[PDB]
C-alpha cells in the first residue's frame, strides 16, 4: 500500500534513487506532453 517493500540495503537505496530520477523524469516528460497538447488545444479552441 504505502511503500514498495524492496528490502532495506544499499541495493535498495541505489534502485530507489534511480526510481526517483526515473519518476521525476517521467513526470516532466508527460508534463511536457501535456503542455504541448494544451497549447495546441487552446489554439484549437480559438480557431
Amino acid at each position: 500500500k504505502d511503500r514498495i517493500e524492496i528490502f532495506p540495503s544499499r541495493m535498495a537505496q541505489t534502485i530507489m534513487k534511480a526510481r526517483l530520477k526515473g519518476a521525476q523524469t517521467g513526470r516532466n516528460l508527460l508534463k511536457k506532453k501535456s503542455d504541448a497538447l494544451t497549447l495546441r488545444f487552446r489554439q484549437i479552441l480559438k480557431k
Binding site: 541505489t14 516528460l29 504541448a36
Partner: protein, 460 residues
C-alpha cells in the same frame, strides 16, 4: 636547537598484532614518534608509534609485520615525530608516499624541516580569495572559475576520466597572463599504470619545472597514504607562505585516503562511525582541506582541487558529503558525458564555483566573463530542457527559439566542453568560444548579459 641526544634501540618486542609491533620497557616514548624497525635478516622498515602507555609503545610498522619476531627484531627510536625535509628544490621532482624521491635524483637538502601535521592557519590572517587561476579546461575556466585560494573538489566516479582531468589541470594550470606559480600534485591509492601515466605525462608534456609530484601507489602500505596528503600540503605551505609562490594543490583521490583512515582507525581498535568511517573524519578532512587560502602580508596562495571518487556514484556518501561541507564548490565529472565520448566530461549544470564572482571580472580576466558564464549556463540549461522537449514533441513542433537553444546545446557540447587532453585554452580562448556560441542567438535573447556588454562583445 636540535636533538643532540643519541637514539635508543630496543629488542623488547613484547608482541605483534596485524600491522602493529608492541615494544615494552620503553623510555619516555612520544605519541607519533618515528622508529626504524630492523628484521632478523637486517632489513630496515619504518614505523610510527600509534599508541603509548607507561612502558609500552605500540608501533604501527609502515610495511606489513611479515618477518618480525619477539627476539631478533630490533627497533631504533628517533626521539622525534615525522618532520619533512622541505625545499623549493622539491619542484621538478617525483616522490613516493614517504617523501623519499624516486626520479633517480638525490635526497632533498632541506631549506627547513617542518612538522608534517602542520598547524591551523590563523583565521585573522587568512585573506579572501580574489583573483582567478587559469586551469585551461573551458568547462572549468568559463563556467566554474577558480579563485586563487578556493578549495573546489572534482567529484567523479569509478571508471570516469578524472585522472586525465587531474593530469590536464596539472599541465595546463597557471596564472592568467594579463613565473612564480607551482603545482603540488599528490596522488593516493594509485594503481601502477596510473602512476606511470602521471609521472610520464608530466615529464613528457613540459610541466615538471613548475610541479612537485607525490605518488602513493595502491600497494604502498596504507599509513603512507595518510601521510601523503599532509606531506604534499606541508610542501605547499612552504612554497606559498615562506617562498611567496602561488600554488595549486591537486589531490588525486580523497576516497582512497578515506579508505586509509578506515584502516588506521581499525588499527587503534576505534569503533567505526557513520558508514564505517571514523567519526572524526570531518575534522581530519578539514585538517587536509583548510591548509589553503591567501594570507595577510604574503603574496603566496594555496588553491586546492581535491579529486574525489564518489563510491557507487552517490553524492550522499560521507566522502563527497563531508567534502561538500568543507570546500567552496564542486565540479562533477559525468558518466553520461563520458559515454558520449565528450572529453573532458565535466557536467556544467550541477557544478558550482561558490567564489566565481570574486575570481573573475574586469582587470582579473576580461570585463564580460562574469556575464558570459551566467548566460552560457542559462543557454545550456534551456538547451537541455529543449532537447528533452524535442524527444517528446518531434522537431516540427519546436519553435524558432527552441531550435536556437538546441543548436547551441549541440555546438556547446561539441566545442565548449569538448577539448581533448593537450589543448591548453587560455581564459581568453574560452571566452571567445563562449561568444562564438552565444552569437548564434539574436542579441535580445541573451537576457542575462547587460546591453553594454553585448554592444562591446557581441559584434565580431
Amino acid at each position: 636547537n636540535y636533538l643532540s641526544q643519541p637514539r635508543l634501540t630496543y629488542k623488547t618486542v613484547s608482541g605483534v598484532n596485524g600491522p602493529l609491533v608492541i615494544l615494552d620497557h620503553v623510555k619516555f616514548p612520544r605519541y607519533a614518534e618515528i622508529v626504524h624497525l630492523t628484521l632478523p635478516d637486517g632489513t630496515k622498515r619504518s614505523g610510527q608509534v600509534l599508541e603509548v602507555s607507561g612502558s609500552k609503545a605500540v608501533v604501527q610498522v609502515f610495511e606489513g609485520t611479515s618477518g618480525i619476531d619477539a627476539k631478533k627484531t630490533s627497533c631504533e627510536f628517533t626521539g622525534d615525530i615525522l618532520r619533512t625535509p622541505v625545499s623549493e628544490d622539491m619542484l621538478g621532482r617525483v616522490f613516493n608516499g614517504s617523501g623519499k624521491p624516486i626520479d633517480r635524483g638525490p635526497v632533498v637538502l632541506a631549506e627547513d624541516f617542518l612538522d608534517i601535521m602542520g598547524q591551523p592557519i590563523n583565521p585573522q590572517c587568512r585573506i579572501y580569495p580574489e583573483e582567478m587561476i587559469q586551469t585551461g579546461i573551458s568547462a572549468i575556466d568559463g563556467m566554474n572559475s577558480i579563485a586563487r585560494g578556493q578549495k573546489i573538489p572534482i567529484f567523479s566516479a569509478a571508471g570516469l576520466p578524472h585522472n586525465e582531468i587531474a593530469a590536464q589541470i596539472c599541465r595546463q594550470a597557471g596564472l592568467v597572463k594579463k613565473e612564480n606559480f607551482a603545482i603540488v600534485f599528490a596522488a593516493m591509492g594509485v594503481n601502477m599504470e596510473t602512476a606511470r601515466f602521471f609521472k610520464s605525462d608530466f615529464e613528457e608534456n613540459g610541466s615538471m619545472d613548475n610541479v612537485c609530484l607525490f605518488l602513493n601507489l595502491a600497494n604502498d602500505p596504507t599509513i603512507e597514504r595518510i601521510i601523503t596528503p599532509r606531506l604534499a600540503l606541508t610542501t605547499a605551505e612552504f612554497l606559498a607562505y615562506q617562498c611567496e609562490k602561488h600554488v595549486l594543490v591537486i589531490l588525486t583521490d580523497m576516497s582512497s585516503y578515506a579508505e586509509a583512515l578506515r584502516e588506521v582507525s581499525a588499527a587503534r581498535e576505534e569503533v567505526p562511525g557513520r558508514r564505517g568511517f571514523p567519526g572524526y573524519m570531518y575534522t581530519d578532512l578539514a585538517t587536509i582541506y583548510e591548509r589553503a587560502g591567501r594570507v595577510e602580508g604574503r603574496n603566496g596562495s594555496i588553491t586546492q582541487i581535491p579529486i574525489l571518487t564518489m563510491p557507487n556514484d552517490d553524492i550522499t556518501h560521507p566522502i563527497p558529503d563531508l567534502t561538500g561541507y568543507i570546500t567552496e564548490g564542486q565540479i562533477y565529472v559525468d558518466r553520461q558525458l563520458h559515454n558520449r565520448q565528450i572529453y573532458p566530461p565535466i557536467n556544467v549544470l550541477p557544478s558550482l564555483s561558490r567564489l566565481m564572482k570574486s575570481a573573475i571580472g574586469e582587470g582579473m580576466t576580461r570585463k564580460d566573463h562574469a556575464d558570459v558564464s551566467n548566460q552560457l549556463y542559462a543557454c545550456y540549461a534551456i538547451g537541455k530542457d529543449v532537447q528533452a522537449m524535442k524527444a517528446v514533441v518531434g522537431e516540427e513542433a519546436l519553435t524558432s527559439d527552441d531550435l536556437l537553444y538546441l543548436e547551441f546545446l549541440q555546438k556547446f557540447e561539441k566545442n565548449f566542453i569538448t577539448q581533448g587532453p593537450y589543448e591548453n585554452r587560455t581564459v581568453y580562448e574560452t571566452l571567445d568560444i563562449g561568444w562564438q556560441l552565444l552569437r548564434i542567438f539574436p542579441k535580445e535573447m541573451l537576457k542575462r548579459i547587460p546591453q553594454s556588454t553585448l554592444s562591446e562583445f557581441y559584434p565580431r
